[PDB]
Amino acid sequence: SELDQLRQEAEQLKNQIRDARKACADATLSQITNNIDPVGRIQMRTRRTLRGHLAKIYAMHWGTDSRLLVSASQDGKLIIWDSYTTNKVHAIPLRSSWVMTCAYAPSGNYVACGGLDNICSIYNLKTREGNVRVSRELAGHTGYLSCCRFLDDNQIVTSSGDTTCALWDIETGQQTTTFTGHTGDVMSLSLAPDTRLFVSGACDASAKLWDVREGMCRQTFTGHESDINAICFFPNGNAFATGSDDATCRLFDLRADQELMTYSHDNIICGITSVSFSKSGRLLLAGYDDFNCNVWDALKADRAGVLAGHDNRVSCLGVTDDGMAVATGSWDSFLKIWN
Amino acid sequence: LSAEDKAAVERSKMIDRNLREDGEKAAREVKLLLLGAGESGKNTIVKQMKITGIVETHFTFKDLHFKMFDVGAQRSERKKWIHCFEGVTAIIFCVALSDYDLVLAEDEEMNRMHASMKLFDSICNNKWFTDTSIILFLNKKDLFEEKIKKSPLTICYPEYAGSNTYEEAAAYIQCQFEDLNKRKDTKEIYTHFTCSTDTKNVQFVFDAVTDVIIKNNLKDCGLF
C-alpha cells in the first residue's frame, strides 16, 4: 500500500509545482526583451595563447584579481598563469593525472583540484617556502570530483560522480553539510555572488539549488533533455544558465522558479561543456564539443558571436571577475584569452 | 621590461623547461585502461603484473614503462569520465570465463558473462576508443576448464555448437567477444587466455602494445 500512495503523492506534488510554475509564467523573457537594442556582432580576438600544457585542459578558473588564472590538464600539471603577460606564475605537479576540475580561491591564497581519484587536493600558493604544496586532501567522496568552488579560504563546495555535493571545513578536512538530492551524478557547480546559495547540475538533467548552511535543496529546475555538463550564475544571483548534451543552453530564474530562455541554433548538434556570463550579465559564453565557443545575447537568445580559435573540444570558459577578458581552455592543450 | 618582469619571464622559462622535460617523460610511458565486469580476475592480473577512485599502477618489464588505470572503483556514469582515456594505447579488458553460468547479483536474471559482454560492447564500440585496441584477457581459465565438465555452456547461450570440450568452448567465448567489435579494421582485439606465470601475462601486454604501436606508426607513415 504505502509506497504506491507515496508515489502518487510524489506525482501529485510534481503536478502541483508544474501547475504553480505555469501559473506564475505570465510572459517569456523573449517577450519582455522585444524592445531592447540587440548586442550585434561580438568580434572578440585571441589576445594571448597560453601554450604550456601538454595534454587536454579540463578546467580553468580566474583569480579575483582578474589577472591570474589557474588551469589544469590531463598532464597531471596545474598551472597558474599571468594572463596579462603569458608567464607561468606556478606549475604544480598533481598526485594524479586525472583532473576533472580546478578552482582558485577568492583571495588567491589557495587552489583546489579534483579528479577520477575522488580526493579534492587543496594547494597553498602563498607559502613561506617558495614551492606550492598541499594543505588538505578532501577524501570522503564516493565518485570522481566533477567541480570545486571555494566560498572562502577555509570552505569549499565540491560535486561528484557519487550524485552528491559536499561543503568542507578545509581546516579539519571533513564535510560539514552534504547534499544528496540528485539521482544522476553531479557535473557542475556555481556559487551565488553572495556565496550563501549554490546551484549544481547533474546527469539527470535536474539543476538543484542549495543554501550551504541549510544543508538541503530549496529548488529543482528540470527543463533540460539529456544531461547537464555546465552551470554559471547570472551576475545578479537571481538566475543561472546550464549547458547540456541536449545541445541547448538554458537560463533558469530562481524567483520565477523555472526556465526563462533556451539558447539553441539548429546547426549546434552537440554538447555544451562549459558556460559563463559576461560581467553585465548580457552575454552567455558557452563552450562546445564542436571545437569552439558560441556567444549569445543572454536576454534575446540570438547568437551574438563565436570564439573560433580551438582545434579540439572547448572544455572551459571563464570571464574575468573584472569583466575584461574571457579565457577558454580546450582539449587541444592551449588556453586562449579573448577580448 | 623591468628588472622584476625579466626575472618573472625567466621563472616562466624555468617552469616551461621543467614542464617540457616532464612531457619528455610522460610521452614515453604507455597508457592502458584496465576494465572488467566487477570482481572478474582483474585484481589477480594486477598483482601478477606488479609481481577511493581510480587506482593507477606502474611497471617496466622489458625496458618499457606502462601506466595502467584500474578504473573499476568508478561505479557511476562512464559517459562523463571515460573520455579522459581517449589517449590510451590499448584498453586491457578482463572476463572471468567462470562467469558463463554465474548470474548478476543485483537481479540474478542475467549471466555474469552477458553482463561482461554488455560492458565489452559498451567500451569497444564507443566513439573515444574507435582506434584504441583492446587487449582481452580471459582470466579464470582453470576454473572454467573444470566447471564446464559439470555445467554445459548452453546455460549461457541459446546458440552454441554444443561441443562442450574446453578448447572449443573457450574459443567460442573468444569468438562471441570478438564478434562484438563493430570496427575490426580500425581496432584489433588481442584475446589471451590468462595463465599462472606472471611474465606470460606481462609479455602478452608488451607484445600487443608493441604491435598496436607499430600498426599506429604504419598508419602514420602511409605504409597502411
Epitope: - | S2, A3, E4, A7, E10, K13
Partner: single-chain antibody, 233 residues
Framework: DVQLVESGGGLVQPGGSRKLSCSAS????????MHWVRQAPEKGLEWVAY????????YYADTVKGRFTISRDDPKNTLFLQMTSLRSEDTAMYYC??????????????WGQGTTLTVSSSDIVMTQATSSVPVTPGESVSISCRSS???????????LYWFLQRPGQSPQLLIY???NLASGVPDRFSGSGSGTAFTLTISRLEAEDVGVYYC?????????FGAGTKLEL
C-alpha cells in the same frame, strides 16, 4: 623555519682572496633568485650581486664586477660569493638574501643573519630625508625617501622596497613595492608615493620599531639602497 646561514669569512690581507658561503635550509632554494647585500661598519646597505633561480641572469654592482663571482649549488641548497683582490673598501657585513619573482611575489623577503668580512692595513641614486628622527611608542612617524628616476614603471607597479634593520639584527622586509606589506609584518606600517618621492608611515609605533630604515629600488640593476633613517627612542 626558513633559514639562510653563512659560514662566510673573517680577516684577510688586502689584495687577498676569500670564499663566502650561504647554506639555505627550510625552503625550496632552487626556485629562489639569490642576492648578496653588504653593509660597511656603521654605514648604509650596498647591493653586491645576484643569481636568478635557473642560475642564469647573474648581475653585479660596478664596485665588485669582475672581482667577485657569485655561484650556487642547488643540490646542496647553497649559494657562494668568491671574492678576489679584496680591497679595504670590501670590509663589511655581507647578507645572503632570497628573492622570488612572479606576479604578486615579495622578493628580498628573507635575509641571512650575515657574515663579517674584514681587511687588514650609471644607476638610480636613492636618498632619505634625514640621518635619524627621535621617537617614543604610541606616536606616528612618516619616514621619506627620494629616487633620482621615476620608479613607477610602465606596467604600473612601483619598485620601491622598504626594509627595517633592528639594532644588531639582519634587515627585514617591511613593504615590497610602494604599498604591499610582507608576511610577518604588522598593520602598523603603510607605504605610499608619487613615483619619484615616497613615504613609509608607522601608524602607532611600538618599541620594536626602533632601528634603521632603508628604502631600495628594484626598477634596474644595480639595486640601490638609501642611507637609512634611524628611529631613536
Amino acid at each position: 623555519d626558513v633559514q639562510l646561514v653563512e659560514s662566510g669569512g673573517g680577516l684577510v690581507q688586502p689584495g687577498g682572496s676569500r670564499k663566502l658561503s650561504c647554506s639555505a635550509s627550510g625552503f625550496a632554494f632552487s626556485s629562489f633568485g639569490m642576492h648578496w647585500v653588504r653593509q660597511a661598519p656603521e654605514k648604509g646597505l650596498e647591493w653586491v650581486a645576484y643569481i636568478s633561480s635557473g642560475s642564469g641572469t647573474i648581475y653585479y654592482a660596478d664596485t665588485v664586477k669582475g672581482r667577485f663571482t657569485i655561484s650556487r649549488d642547488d643540490p646542496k641548497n647553497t649559494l657562494f660569493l668568491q671574492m678576489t683582490s679584496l680591497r679595504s673598501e670590501d670590509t663589511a657585513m655581507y647578507y645572503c638574501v632570497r628573492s622570488i619573482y612572479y606576479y604578486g611575489s615579495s622578493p628580498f623577503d628573507f635575509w641571512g643573519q650575515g657574515t663579517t668580512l674584514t681587511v687588514s692595513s650609471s644607476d638610480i641614486v636613492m636618498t632619505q630625508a634625514t640621518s635619524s628622527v627621535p621617537v617614543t611608542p604610541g606616536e606616528s612617524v612618516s619616514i621619506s625617501c627620494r629616487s633620482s628616476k621615476s620608479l613607477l614603471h610602465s606596467n604600473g607597479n612601483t619598485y620601491l622596497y622598504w626594509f627595517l634593520q633592528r639594532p644588531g639584527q639582519s634587515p627585514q622586509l617591511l613593504i615590497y613595492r610602494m604599498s604591499n606589506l610582507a608576511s610577518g609584518v604588522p598593520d602598523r606600517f603603510s607605504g605610499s608615493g608619487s613615483g619619484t618621492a615616497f613615504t613609509l608611515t608607522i601608524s602607532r609605533l611600538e618599541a620594536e620599531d626602533v632601528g634603521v630604515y632603508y628604502c631600495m629600488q628594484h626598477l634596474e640593476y644595480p639595486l640601490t639602497f638609501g642611507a637609512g633613517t634611524k628611529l631613536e627612542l
